[PDB]
Design a binder for this molecule. Structure first.
Ligand SMILES: Nc1ncnc2c1ncn2[C@@H]1O[C@H](COP(=O)(O)OP(=O)(O)O)[C@@H](O)[C@H]1O
Ligand SMILES: Nc1ncnc2c1ncn2[C@@H]1O[C@H](COP(=O)(O)OP(=O)(O)O)[C@@H](O)[C@H]1O
Ligand SMILES: Nc1ncnc2c1ncn2[C@@H]1O[C@H](COP(=O)(O)OP(=O)(O)O)[C@@H](O)[C@H]1O
Ligand SMILES: Nc1ncnc2c1ncn2[C@@H]1O[C@H](COP(=O)(O)OP(=O)(O)O)[C@@H](O)[C@H]1O
Ligand code: ICS
Ligand code: CLF
Ligand code: SF4
Ligand code: SF4
Ligand code: FES
Ligand code: FES
Ligand SMILES: [Mg+2]
Ligand SMILES: [Mg+2]
Ligand SMILES: [Mg+2]
Ligand SMILES: [Mg+2]
Lengths: 391, 274, 121, 283, 121, 280, 272, 98
């Protein structure tokens, strides 16, 4: 309640800023009205951060290397440039995976060119080719290389696409150049976009002329789940217990083969719309694969999403979904009965990157908590369209 | 809520006549707004009492961008009814000289300066050449009525012909029409009937014949309109009559262009050119 | 990146190869190949380098950032519909009309058309 | 062997007549001169070709479909021993009015009219506004020496100031320089010394002062230059002196533009405008 | 040979690789890639397959033969000016507007624009 | 199951009214059908939504940036118990091809996927004065599975039906497009039922129920409502209903046999509409 | 030489009204030319007394190309010294239906059939759709005067409005003007002043009102035009008066389009 | 010309693919590649190869350009494919242009 109090609080808070900063930041703070359908008249998003205000946003390299490309385990990701960028993002994200690190998996390892002064002055294309050769000799079991470029790569004018093509032709390897320089874009969203573009342009269209894979009418592909602490595995067990077959996982515990086999999937289940809506739209336009957004946070959203996913198949899938719901009902009923009285009536404030502020609202409300303030670092206006109704 | 543009060659007394028309319309219970699209920001000097009104684009560059700019900063009411905005222009050699006009018009439409209280909008626009931002009011149907200020000098009628051709080209786009011709006079013989004949051959009508006067120099050293300075002077009542004819105008026509030889033969028969 | 420069001033369209993502913009590529796009400032506010860019490979369209300076210049020129602004703001897709001095070459095939006049007719 | 020159100024002061008379005087000295009319009025080759109007490059390109098929002979017309071409302009209301200039010069450079078979190349350019097309000969280093026609009028010296601003803007990338100021009489008492002071402020000189002679209309009624009409008149002598000092001009300086207040006070200094005071603003 | 098909009906421009000189015409290339150019005749006398061809590599323009039937059809829809007809007759250079069923792919980069309507508006 | 029908004929003989009443009857019979108005004047959906001439796809497309920015709900409206309506529109007169709107609207609907599985009938009301252009787009691109031509006893409608049959036979080999029958809209002229029957027999096809004229159609039109729901107990409501059952139960889809203009003249002569012509 | 075009929807007596106009004009010693821009090959049957004049497109197809076509076989002279040109369209579904008009006009200009001391040229153009070769005379500034044949029916008035919009679109690029609104009767109440009201609403003037009668059909059986079938007929004199008003017409105006609701209200408040 | 015929000059010589029916039916490009290899084997002193196509080459459908590019890159020697089919052009005039 106290909408006028909220507006007065916003006005009082905005007082310390200079005129430019105050005028810009007034557009980014809003009082929620669930009846609003278009967020553009209520809130403004996807704009540059005001200098010297201690923003929490990252860079495009963080959104591309650290978010999308990183969870892929059988590929080797080269942080092309100075040493710090790879160091600070090393194993800082809990994208779980299965494999023997250093032999066939490389998620928690830091590959870098380690640019020096002579690299900046002269260039690093020959150094990049030599590095690719050294990776090939030292890590034979790697199934692909991706070169994530940092700021100096685009700032000095290096041609990593030509190097990638030449080395991939020479070694018969999949080399993916990603131009994810930090200054490109205002946050990690452009990093997501660039990573999706790289996946589409260099990886996705590989098993297009073959048909060796045996397809099944119950083929689904998880998109936008990065296995943070094992979330993707819980979602996978929930989907397989429904009778569907999960072919691909983007990208937590994901493999290059799964990404290449994704176009042979009947339905795409997109968890993170913000990071992987681009590739889903491309898949729908090219291969004709329908895609749909689901929510597995809390029991209510999980049941609703399970029923919605089952509605896209025959009646056997619906009966299996009902069986799964009946099986799992007592567990979450007991969890609620145990924990709700301790947490009932508490007010919670949220501030996360994208699509998590709105997704976890149902989980909090399932225990009696209420969200009083939420927001995003880099969500666009469609995310605010989606999150107005849920608050 | 009627929009009129004042078009003509530079140096034809366009700004002075427009400001006198505005001041004559203000007294008769009408709230109007002047917009100066000439690169020179002197279209509002006789109203604002100012030395040089700060143009929109100057302050837009000083304040970073147009988005960080406020309506109250550009929209100054030197007179209570009158409201003046200065579009401005870029430094010579820097892009199109008319993009300031587009910026000013888009800013005014964005901030809703055309709301609920305007009887007349006037655009004092550069007519030596019609292109880009200066052709924008004709092109984008921003100014329904267009009045050309011209004299007996060959280049004045040449500019009037160019503006007539420009109106003809966008005749089917909207309701942009030529509402009449305005006679700013130098001390030369056979001037009124010259542009009268020009009007009949264009299919339009001559609005008024405003001759030269000494009171205009007293006004410019005063930095105020003649009607504000000396409302009893004959040219004050003459500007009043010009404004009255402007208000009570009903016929707006699609102009007819005139070839070079035909205007030349008109100037021949009048003898201004030997 | 393959760039095809076309203009009524040029007797023939030219095909050039460019390094993607260079700090030097499309303007660097135009200057080093003798393409006479009118550049008339160094702070990116004149708008005289306005060009029309067509992505010949529709599949290989790369998302980009439309900076506020480019947006304001394009609005001051008039080559920016509200629909394209919304598309660039939400889907991070480039508009039809760009500024050569502020356009970074992406890894795709592009057709760049200019009339030889400054932006804004 | 080629001196590329341009004549700028506000429309209506006499750029075309002065340019044509200067070319006529130059042709008497055995020089071979070529004229480019970059003004949309398309009358800068009238007094030399004796014709009603020279067909413009844009008109030929429209009637023939494109500029690549256009020949030099139908575009370049040789009269009085000097070559003449007209840039023309687009329909008023569409495109950029200076675009014809951009279409013309380019075309010429590809056809060979710009080869050094000529002593003088002149561009009669409209300088009432400095935009693309009308500033292209300055931007593309196509005019070494710029001469500004100016009268004792506020607008004329404003245009001179704007052209000098363009010149100083494009002074670091090319050799475009201001060769002087030409004054055409407007029957003003103090105009000679006025533009003398203006040139001193700008750091440049008068090349010459041209008196207002009624014989120029008598020459134009025949579609003729005044030099050919009376070789023995004093106006022809003034034009010949202007031509000889244009040839002997060696002061090519980067101008120093003045502000609006400086121009206003320069107008005040010579009596054209009365004295302004701050205590007599509200009455 | 690279061909870029463009149309307001097509959401994205389509890039295809074609073999030059084939007996099958540009219509064969369009049909293999699912480009919906209206083909409403089998004798090349209608104007349904009218397209606008732009040679992106201006230096690599190949001389061809403009057949009399194609010339007459192009004149019938008013898409062949006199200057381009004379150019085709003398210099053996192609006109801007072509017929897909009568157009032979050459070894160059081409942009084929169509609006989905038959020739002749 | 996903049956696609087109209604052709000369402009002004009642294609829109007949199509709307047919669709009203089909919806009354518990069939979810969809109307696409491909006629340039854009009034094919007036009597369903009851509001006004529905805003066409071209108007939003011009107002928006592209036909992709346009929303499916924005143009595809619902009325009369969930029956769906889309309107093609057209370009400005003297610009482009008048049938461009048909191509744009069909491409848009196909791309968004409005052709849902639970639809049973999709009726295109198109203009048959000129077969060419986008008006031939439904036949050439097999958009319309079966075609019904409305006709009257006039020369112009007869010739228009002949031209439509010519288009059908020209494009018959490349698609499942076929002629279902002919509908005779009455002008109260004498000996016109057997006239249309004779033309249908000449074309080799059967003749969809003949609709007599009356003033109840204008009474329903003035209220912006179909005859079926203005007065379901009238003979006209069950008339359109019977035409509807014959449409659903129609199974004779044949390749027509277009006839010569001289055959048309003699077939008009033999029924008294056209007077006997003597060479002397 | 005056170039005039006759537009309107198909079925409104356009062809026979144009034929009577030109025959009446030929009765006064004037020489006229007819170009039939209608795909139906019936625009010149009543002045040549033929089953169907062979069209330019048919001859071009049979003679290979249009370059082998001769002017004598396409230009046939009829009663009164009238020159007759017939522009057939292609088969339904085969390209644009207006290619015939463009081909015929280009051929006529190339062979010089206009400058032969003609005074009146009449283009009988289909007006159901204004596009392609049917809007070509307006696009290319071929017909300076245009007359629309309409009646008190919604289709006819809508066609007139569409042709007026087409005139407005190309008004600035040439001297194409709408002279008037020809009205043909279908024996309905309150039709003359309905069309006068439409003409006054969109800026033109009604030229002449043509009533329906049976004499024109009796002449049509004989492949005959009304005036030289029976010159003393009342309808023959009405056609003569129509011709007199056409030749002595000096009002050329640019119309203004009327909206759908405006036309609906105009039709409703006049009793239909 | 001045040269040793068959060693470093080949003007009066006739090198041809000599197509048969099986070449008309099944491709023909691999025959072109094998022909280029044999030419390089037996005539090492040549400074380039041109492939002048005759009438059936365009008709059956063949990509001599890709073969030219591939073999020129492989053997580091210029290969010029000339689509000088007889049916293209009304006379020898278009052959000059090609
Ligand atoms: N009615 C008039 N009587 C005398 N002088 C006038 C009159 N109107 C304008 N002028 C003079 O014409 C000159 C041009 O004025 P201005 O409008 O500022 O230039 P522009 O027409 O180029 O905008 C002014 O100096 C003014 O003194
Ligand atoms: N030296 C001169 N003395 C007197 N009148 C002149 C002189 N030069 C030009 N004029 C007059 O100026 C008028 C217009 O000048 P013009 O040369 O057309 O202007 P612009 O410089 O714009 O070409 C002409 O009619 C001419 O009579
Ligand atoms: N079955 C019918 N009986 C009588 N009149 C009808 C019938 N159908 C339509 N009409 C009349 O025809 C007129 C227009 O018909 P409409 O359906 O608009 O033609 P179109 O098929 O060209 O759209 C309407 O005013 C209506 O009164
Ligand atoms: N004044 C009239 N009186 C009676 N009937 C007419 C009149 N004018 C035209 N008609 C009839 O209208 C029909 C129109 O056909 P026609 O004029 O040949 O071509 P269109 O269909 O293009 O008008 C004719 O068959 C004719 O019988
Ligand atoms: S990808 Fe995104 S910041 Fe969607 S960059 Fe970030 S593992 Fe957040 S709110 Mo860390 S748009 Fe994922 C995210 Fe959300 S790293 Fe994780 S938690 S659901
Ligand atoms: S925005 Fe992104 S993370 Fe930042 S540098 Fe740029 S690519 Fe990288 Fe790594 S190295 Fe250190 S922390 Fe930077 S200053 Fe140079
Ligand atoms: S359009 Fe006009 S204002 Fe703009 S640059 Fe060209 S000449 Fe200058
Ligand atoms: S194809 Fe038909 S509808 Fe299209 S423009 Fe041509 S005549 Fe008109
Ligand atoms: S060079 Fe001026 S905006 Fe780009
Ligand atoms: S399909 Fe008819 S000309 Fe090509
Ligand atoms: Mg002024
Ligand atoms: Mg001049
Ligand atoms: Mg209808
Ligand atoms: Mg007829």
């Amino acid at each position: 309640m106290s909408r006028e109090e909220v507006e007065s609080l916003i006005q009082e808070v905005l007082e310390v800023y200079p005129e430019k900063a105050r005028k810009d930041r007034n557009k980014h703070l809003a009082v929620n009205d669930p009846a609003v359908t278009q967020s553009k008249k209520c809130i403004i998003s996807n704009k540059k951060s005001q200098p010297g205000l201690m923003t929490i946003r990252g860079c495009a390299y963080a959104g591309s290397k650290g978010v999308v490309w990183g969870p892929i385990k059988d590929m080797i990701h080269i942080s092309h440039g100075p040493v710090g960028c790879g160091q600070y993002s090393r194993a800082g994200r809990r994208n779980y995976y299965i494999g023997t690190t250093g032999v066939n998996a490389f998620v928690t390892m830091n590959f870098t060119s380690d640019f020096q002064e002579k690299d900046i002055v002269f260039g690093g294309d020959k150094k990049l080719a030599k590095l690719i050769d050294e990776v090939e000799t030292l890590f034979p079991l790697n199934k692909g290389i991706s070169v994530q470029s940092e700021c100096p790569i685009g700032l000095i004018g290096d041609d990593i696409e030509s190097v990638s093509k030449v080395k991939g032709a020479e070694l018969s390897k999949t080399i993916v150049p990603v131009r994810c320089e930090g200054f490109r874009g205002v946050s990690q969203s452009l990093g997501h976009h660039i990573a999706n573009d790289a996946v589409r342009d260099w990886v996705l269209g590989k098993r297009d002329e073959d048909t060796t894979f045996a397809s099944t009418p119950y083929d689904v592909a998880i998109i936008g789940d990065y296995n943070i602490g094992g979330d993707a595995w819980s979602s996978r067990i929930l989907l397989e217990e429904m009778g569907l077959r999960c072919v691909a996982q983007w990208s937590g515990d994901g493999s290059i083969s799964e990404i290449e086999l994704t176009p042979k999937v009947k339905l795409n289940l997109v968890h993170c719309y913000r990071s992987m809506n681009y590739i889903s739209r491309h898949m729908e336009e090219k291969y004709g694969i329908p895609w749909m957004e689901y929510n597995f946070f809390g029991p209510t959203k999980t049941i609703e999403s399970l029923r919605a996913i089952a509605a896209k198949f025959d009646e056997s899938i619906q009966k299996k979904c009902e069986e799964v719901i009946a099986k799992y009902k007592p567990e979450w009923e007991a969890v609620v009965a145990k924990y709700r009285p301790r947490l009932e009536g508490k007010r919670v404030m949220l501030y996360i990157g994208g699509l998590r502020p709105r997704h976890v609202i149902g989980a909090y409300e399932d225990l009696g908590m209420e969200v009083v303030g939420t927001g995003y670092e880099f969500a666009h206006n469609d995310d605010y369209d989606r999150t107005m109704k849920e608050m | 809520m009627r929009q009129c543009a004042i078009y003509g060659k530079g140096g034809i007394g366009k700004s002075t006549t427009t400001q006198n028309l505005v001041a004559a319309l203000a007294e008769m219970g009408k709230k109007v707004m002047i917009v100066g699209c000439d690169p020179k920001a002197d279209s509002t000097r006789l109203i604002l009492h100012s030395k040089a009104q700060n143009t929109i684009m100057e302050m837009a560059a000083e304040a970073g961008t147009v988005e960080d700019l406020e309506l109250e900063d550009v929209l100054k009411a030197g007179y209570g009814g009158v409201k003046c905005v200065e579009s401005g222009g870029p430094e010579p050699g820097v892009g199109c000289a008319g993009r300031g006009v587009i910026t000013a018009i888009n800013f005014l439409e964005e901030e809703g300066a055309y709301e609920d209280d305007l009887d007349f909008v006037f655009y004092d626009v550069l007519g030596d050449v019609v292109c880009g931002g200066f052709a924008m009011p004709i092109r984008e149907n921003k100014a329904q009525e267009i009045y050309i200020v011209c004299s007996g000098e060959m280049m004045a009628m040449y500019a009037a012909n160019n503006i007539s051709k420009g109106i003809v080209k966008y005749a089917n786009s909207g309701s942009v029409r030529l509402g009449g011709l305005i006679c700013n006079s130098r001390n030369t013989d056979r001037e009124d009937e010259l542009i009268i004949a020009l009007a009949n051959k264009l299919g339009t009508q001559m609005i008024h014949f405003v001759p030269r006067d000494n009171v205009v120099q007293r006004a410019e050293i005063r930095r105020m309109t003649v009607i504000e300075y000396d409302p009893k002077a004959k040219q004050a009542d003459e500007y009043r009559a010009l404004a009255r004819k402007v208000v009570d105008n009903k016929l707006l026509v699609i102009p007819n262009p005139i070839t070079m030889d035909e205007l030349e033969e008109l100037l021949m028969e009048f003898g201004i050119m030997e | 990146a393959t760039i095809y420069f076309s203009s009524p001033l040029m007797p023939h369209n030219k095909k050039v190869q460019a390094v993607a993502g260079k700090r030097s913009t499309l303007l660097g590529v135009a200057q080093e190949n003798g393409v006479k796009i009118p550049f008339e400032c160094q702070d990116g506010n004149c708008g005289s380098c306005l060009v029309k860019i067509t992505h010949l490979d529709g599949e290989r369209i790369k998302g980009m950032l439309l900076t506020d300076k480019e947006r304001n210049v394009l609005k001051s020129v008039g080559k920016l519909p509200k629909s394209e602004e919304e598309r660039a703001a939400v889907r991070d897709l480039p508009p039809t009309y760009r500024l050569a001095c502020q356009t970074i070459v992406t890894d795709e095939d592009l057709l760049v058309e200019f009339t030889g006049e400054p932006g804004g007719a």
